[PDB]
Amino acid sequence: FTLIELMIVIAIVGILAAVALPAYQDYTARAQVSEAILLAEGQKSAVTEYYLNHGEWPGDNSSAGVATSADIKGKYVQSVTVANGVITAQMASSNVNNEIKSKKLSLWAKRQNGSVKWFCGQPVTRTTATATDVAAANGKTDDKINTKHLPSTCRDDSSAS
Amino acid sequence: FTLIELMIVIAIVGILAAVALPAYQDYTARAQVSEAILLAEGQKSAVTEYYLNHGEWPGDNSSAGVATSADIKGKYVQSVTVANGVITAQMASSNVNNEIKSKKLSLWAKRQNGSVKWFCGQPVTRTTATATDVAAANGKTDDKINTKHLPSTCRDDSSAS
Amino acid sequence: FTLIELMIVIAIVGILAAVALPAYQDYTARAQVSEAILLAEGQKSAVTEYYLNHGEWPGDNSSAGVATSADIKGKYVQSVTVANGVITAQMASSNVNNEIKSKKLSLWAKRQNGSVKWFCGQPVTRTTATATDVAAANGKTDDKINTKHLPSTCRDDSSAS
């Protein structure tokens, strides 16, 4: 009945190759998400510049005069969009974490002691291109990204100022 | 004849210490391969810069003006080479997975909605330094690396655009 | 005299619960050792940075300006030290493999076609903070770790370049 001991070793192996893997489709997502974060970053400039020139954020890419929603893109990026200076990009719809598939988070800068502070966080939009305060246009959170599937920092709401 | 039961336990041990180890020379390879992936990454910059400055990729390291094939190297890297902006490095010829011994995969960026998208995948080369489209110069697949012995992502062909 | 057959089964059990366990205090060691390997890894950065900034490795943690010998530590780590850019940590002195108890191995990077190549291997030290070549300061091999009690790779001597 070392066989048991064997079948034990079998048994413990039996229930050892199942459900012993947390959150990795969760984890890949973050980077897979974060890949999307990497792109619209540059848009912030003319967005600022537009705000810099004018004092008002650009209502969008085109207000800024820059690459629109369906513009600048690639892997994990099926849109890149500005909203009254609030910039946003979307996850791809495949080869992703099945979860984060096609998700976004906005990028909104509200004026500081310094110039302004952006925010890597939830899909939101600025009340006006003129304003700095932005609105949590949540898109029923689909594009919104799990703060879990987000890293610790990039967990911002429109409220972020 | 617990002896049988014994010799059984022997027998099951008999055919238990043979062929019960899949794919690990396969697995080490991936990292051993992936080690090689880690290096030519930096070359992408001047490659881009060359493409950035010019609008044309650098025909190679030297076109870019950067570390040639037999340049930047070390463990698991017995070459690091650019091909019309398409960059490639080779596995070592020892202390490796006997399989992946001396193998490569190219690195080719083709222009995006964004700037451009590289590709970790098979040894290939760009049609022209001017171009973005690259050619699956396969080297009879020796340097080409097993998509199995590659991780899931780094499975790209010249076609990757 | 099935009793013999019994006492046989007894007898074969008699000399079956003794000396039939190789090298496991040897094996735990490796990981128990390798635990120590896990830590000083981060030190390599400023070490590099010091070498990166200066062109010379940091004579130590303090030359680099980083966590000294008795600094960064924990389980299986009763020291973590840099030596002219050559970094080293020691095994604990208890709850270990009684063998590997309080043992080390250095970490020395010598300049490449690429930048440089480190080495997980024996306690050694770099001739100069300026240099790359390192000296097999062996400490009478106590801190030096059994290549057996080391895994296959992490078997490097100062000579490793």
Added chain:
Amino acid sequence: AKRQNGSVKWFCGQPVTRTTATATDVAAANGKTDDKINTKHLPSTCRDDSSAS
């Protein structure tokens, strides 16, 4: 920033203060090093003292 062959050279480093607004030489007003930042927790370069000139 303390005046150079060129104009002047700044220094990313420890909380310090210049002896005078007129001067260039600065004083290592250290604030008991709390605000002062660990050269470890600093990168390699930004490791400057008032002495930095």
